[PDB]
């Protein structure tokens, strides 16, 4: 599905992504807006036969399984469908494992050229939280 801001912000809080590894909730929400405009079925297919899936556009060459992606490291140890469900749990659970490598949120392309540097906490304001 597609989430509203607040809905995504709240789904993101219950899941405990506020100030995760130094990342305020605002950052999670912002990366979600320019990565997929909050659609959990969003999918970009790359030249190497690899695809980016879900709300945070997680690449299957590294973190998940789809059945063909090249080296397919599957660092998160998850099937990529788990990332297309409307149940955001798996992309949340993988998100914490990605941010944890010497990359931080720089791992997200939309966050680095769009969110990095701005008052990102603006993304959870006016949400009754």
Curated annotation (Swiss-Prot):
The answer to whether the entry has keyword rRNA-binding is: no
Let me know which tissues express this protein, per UniProt: In the egg white and polymorphonuclear leukocytes.
Name where it's found.
Answer: Secreted
CDD domains, alphabetized: LYZ_C
Tell me which stretches of the chain form a coiled coil: none
Name the Pfam families on file. Lys
Q: What class of enzyme is it?
A: hydrolase
- The residues that hold substrate are 101
Domain called C-type lysozyme: residue spans: 1-129
- Please give the Gene Ontology molecular function terms for this protein: beta-N-acetylglucosaminidase activity; identical protein binding; lysozyme activity
One GO cellular-component annotation of the UniProt record comes to: endoplasmic reticulum
Task: Give me the reactions it catalyses.
Answer: Hydrolysis of (1->4)-beta-linkages between N-acetylmuramic acid and N-acetyl-D-glucosamine residues in a peptidoglycan and between N-acetyl-D-glucosamine residues in chitodextrins
Disulfide-bonded cysteines:
6-127, 30-115, 64-80, 76-94
Q: Provide the active-site residues from the annotation.
A: 35, 52
Question: Which keywords appear in this protein's UniProt record, sorted alphabetically?
Answer: Allergen, Antimicrobial, Bacteriolytic enzyme, Disulfide bond, Glycosidase, Hydrolase, Secreted, Signal
Q: Which family does it belong to?
A: Belongs to the glycosyl hydrolase 22 family.
The record's note on quaternary structure and interaction partners says: Monomer.
PANTHER family (alphabetical): LYSOZYME C (PTHR11407:SF28)
What more the UniProt record tells us is: Lysozyme C is capable of both hydrolysis and transglycosylation; it also shows a slight esterase activity. It acts rapidly on both peptide-substituted and unsubstituted peptidoglycan, and slowly on chitin oligosaccharides.
Name by which UniProt lists this protein: Lysozyme C
> Origin organism of this chain?
Gallus gallus
Q: Tell me what gene encodes this.
A: LYZ
């Amino acid at each position: 599905k597609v989430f509203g801001r607040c809905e995504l912000a709240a789904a993101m809080k219950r899941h405990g992504l506020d100030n995760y590894r130094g990342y305020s909730l605002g950052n999670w929400v912002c990366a979600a807006k320019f990565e997929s405009n909050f659609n959990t079925q969003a999918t970009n297919r790359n030249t190497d036969g690899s695809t980016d899936y879900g709300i945070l556009q997680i690449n299957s060459r590294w973190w998940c399984n789809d059945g063909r992606t090249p080296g397919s490291r599957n660092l998160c140890n998850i099937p990529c469908s788990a990332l297309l469900s409307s149940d955001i749990t798996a992309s949340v659970n993988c998100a914490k494992k990605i941010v944890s490598d010497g990359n931080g949120m720089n791992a997200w392309v939309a966050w680095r050229n769009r969110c990095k540097g701005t008052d990102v906490q603006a993304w959870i304001r006016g949400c009754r939280l």
